[PDB]
Amino acid sequence: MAAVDLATHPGHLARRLQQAHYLLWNTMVSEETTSPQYAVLNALVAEPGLDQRTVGERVGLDRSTIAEVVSRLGRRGLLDKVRDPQDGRRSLLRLTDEGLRVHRRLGVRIARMNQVFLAPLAADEQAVFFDLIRRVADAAE
Amino acid sequence: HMAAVDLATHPGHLARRLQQAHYLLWNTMVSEETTSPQYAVLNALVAEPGLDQRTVGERVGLDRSTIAEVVSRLGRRGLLDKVRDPQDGRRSLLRLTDEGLRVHRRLGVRIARMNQVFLAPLAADEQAVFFDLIRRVADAAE
């Protein structure tokens, strides 16, 4: 009988934001490297030799998605996977030179995407936006 | 020589996380059987029946292929129907079924609870700002 106003539904806005993100990424950044792949590349630039489990916890990707990403980056020779010598049943991840090279290249394009993405907002609003969305994203903790 | 970026300042990163959170909350609190794009279409037909596929997609933010896939899927489930326009005899119209409205109503109750949990980290005033900011950022996609 009664329809709802989707403009007040956070999930509706969430889907549309991610679609916009997926569009901007494939248009301005890459059709080969996905954003979760970049996220993993970045985590390994920040902390070389990081445990695969820890990488997942850091960039917000589950254990299966991380395994998939690591496999794909590995196949492309952007990433090296090695057994943790101390804990033989743990895996450590390091970027190759080409992996670092890909990460650097994409970062230039991403910087352009983000300016496009954030252009509708004033500077003070951008900070607020970052804070609010992160807090709402943690609602599924 | 390696310089990592702060993902907390990347709107696309936050976008992915938020939608991940959305997807999780939807499948646990709302439905494993009906997706959120499917509900959006159902809801769009509750608001103004007689919309065609093209307009509905524009309403709920679904591109040509996706809206076509969602509508067809809803059709197969028996939640949605098609009918010829009396005026433009070739332009087909979308109409809800008894079951479609029943599904729409049932999920709405569940959705309201999901939204309480989803928006709980924010104060009421922050929620209004959140809706505005995210809508404007989402519209950056020309």
Q: Tokens 């009918």 — which residue?
A: B83
Residues whose CB is less than 8 angstroms from the CB of residue B142 and which lie 6 or more positions away in sequence, other chains included: none
Question: How far is B50 from B118, CA to CA, in rounded Å?
Answer: 32
Question: How far is A62 from A60, CA to CA, in rounded Å?
Answer: 7
Question: How far is B137 from A20, CA to CA, in rounded Å?
Answer: 9
Helix axes A63-75, A35-46, angle to 10 degrees: 80
Q: How far is B7 from chain A (nearest CA, A)?
A: 8
Bridge partner list, A93: A50, A81
Residues whose CB is less than 8 angstroms from the CB of residue B97 and which lie 6 or more positions away in sequence, other chains included: B78, B79, B80, B81
DSSP string, A97-114: HHHHHHHHHHHHHHHHHH
What is the three-class DSSP state of A31?
coil
C-beta of residue B30 within 8 angstroms of C-beta of residue B107: yes
Q: How far is CA B51 from the centre of its chain?
A: 16
Structure tokens at A98: 């080409």
What is the 8-class DSSP label of residue A29?
I
What is the three-class DSSP state of A120?
coil
- Residue of chain A whose Cα is closest to the Cα of B113: A9
- Helix boundaries (H) for A47-120: 52-59, 63-75, 97-118
Single out the residue of B17, B47, B20, B18 nearest to residue B108, CA to CA: B47
Domain count across chain A: 1
| CATH number, domain with residue B116 | 1.10.10.10
What is the 8-class DSSP label of residue B90?
T
Structure tokens at A24: 């901007």
CA quadruple B142, B136, A114, A76: dihedral positive or negative? negative
Q: Tokens 């990488």 — which residue?
A: A55
Q: Domain of A76?
A: 1-141
C-beta of residue A111 within 8 angstroms of C-beta of residue A131: no
Whether chain B has a CB inside 8 Å of the CB on A20: the answer is yes
Residues whose CB is less than 8 angstroms from the CB of residue A125 and which lie 6 or more positions away in sequence, other chains included: B133
- Residue of chain A whose Cα is closest to the Cα of B26: A11
Question: How far is A43 from B4, CA to CA, in rounded Å?
Answer: 7
Single out the residue of B65, B133, B10, B9 nearest to residue A120, CA to CA: B133
What is the three-class DSSP state of A91?
strand
Task: Show which of residues 27-56 on chain B sit within 8 Å of chain A, judged by CB atoms.
Answer: 36-37, 40, 43-44, 46-47
What is the 8-class DSSP label of residue A30?
-
Single out the residue of A10, A80, A127 nearest to residue B6, CA to CA: A127
Strand order, beta sheet including A50-51:
A50-51, A91-95, A79-83
Q: Tokens 């509750």 — which residue?
A: B46
Whether chain A has a CB inside 8 Å of the CB on B83: the answer is no
Residues whose CB is less than 8 angstroms from the CB of residue B89 and which lie 6 or more positions away in sequence, other chains included: none
C-beta of residue A84 within 8 angstroms of C-beta of residue A51: yes
- Helix boundaries (H) for chain B: 11-29, 36-47, 53-60, 64-77, 98-119, 124-138
Question: How far is B98 from B80, CA to CA, in rounded Å?
Answer: 9
Question: How far is A126 from B136, CA to CA, in rounded Å?
Answer: 11
Q: Is beta strand A50-51 parallel, antiparallel or unpaired with respect to A91-95?
A: antiparallel
Task: List chain B residues with CB under 8 Å of A3.
Answer: 43-44, 46-47
Contact B137 A129 (CB under 8 A): yes
Question: How far is A115 from B140, CA to CA, in rounded Å?
Answer: 10
Question: How far is B129 from B114, CA to CA, in rounded Å?
Answer: 19
C-beta of residue A40 within 8 angstroms of C-beta of residue A61: yes
Question: How far is A73 from A41, CA to CA, in rounded Å?
Answer: 9
